[PDB]
Design a protein around this ligand. Structure first.
Ligand code: 0BJ
Ligand code: 0BJ
Lengths: 148, 148
């Protein structure tokens, strides 16, 4: 398992790419197989593969302006090649103001330079309203692109 | 900062006491001024202090029958005297079946033997229904006890 400071460097580049709020910046630290699973398991939100998130994040970021990320807690388990962060976010969306908070579990690859698995719990009351707004927005971008 | 194995021992006792589901077993790792904070911050849930916890847990535990804890993930940051765990639970309650899942952030005291701060995010759809039900059930116990 890679040295702490290398994993920690991956964590920071993930958070900074998140704050930078472009697809390429944020997805730079995700491996090709990195899955994102929404917790709790009981909410039955299907795990999301990399083709899914590569298609979502451009659309998602385009409808969140003044995105500000705030990191409250980094728990680094260098021996286990693992981490957990707590973050909060705000943005303006086509649907009104957006706020969220995130408990995020990360796993790194052997080299400690990519994130390989993501599991996350968020503000489910924010998401109950926003996920369907986002899904219909995504479908509208899809249809609009296929036409042209 | 205490050695990693001593901090890990408190984690293991915390989860084992939780599993054993008695006020004494679970609380043995809680420092005497340890606070419990519900995330997200945006839901503005007041800190539960140790006295609140000591009154709540005997009632709460008494209406959760067949309680089962499953631990999914332990993120230990010995260098920062911190940790994060992910757990899920089931039980039978007088309000029907119960399921919950917890992303818990733990801080230890200097000795690494007590837990000093708890911040957790849970299944907010469980808690939306359960929390008022437990609050009314707790008031009823306090009333029934007073008049004896
Ligand atoms: C800020 O947005 C992110 O890129 C994001 C990133 C991470 C690591 C977890 C998330 O929960 C989100 C998210 O907020 C989100 C969403 O709000 C709607 C659909 C999918 C998502 O991933
Ligand atoms: C299983 O119960 C616990 O002792 C418990 C314990 C921890 C570490 C987090 C919790 O969220 C709970 C809880 O589930 C709970 C509840 O369901 C209602 C009121 C207070 C609580 O702490």
């Amino acid at each position: 398992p890679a040295p702490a400071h290398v994993q920690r460097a991956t964590i920071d580049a993930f958070l900074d790419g998140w704050d930078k709020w472009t697809p390429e910046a944020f997805l730079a630290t995700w491996s090709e197989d990195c899955t994102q699973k929404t917790l709790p398991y009981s909410h039955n939100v299907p795990i999301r593969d990399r083709a899914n998130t590569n298609h979502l994040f451009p659309i998602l970021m385009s409808i969140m302006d003044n995105f500000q990320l705030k990191t409250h807690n980094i728990v680094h388990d260098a021996a286990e090649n693992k981490a957990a962060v707590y973050c909060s976010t705000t943005a303006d969306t086509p649907f009104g103001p957006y706020t969220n908070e995130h408990a995020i579990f990360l796993w790194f690859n052997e080299a400690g330079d990519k994130i390989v698995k993501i599991e996350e719990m968020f503000d489910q009351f924010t998401m109950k309203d926003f996920a369907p707004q986002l899904e219909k927005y995504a479908q509208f971008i899809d249809k609009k692109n296929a036409r042209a």
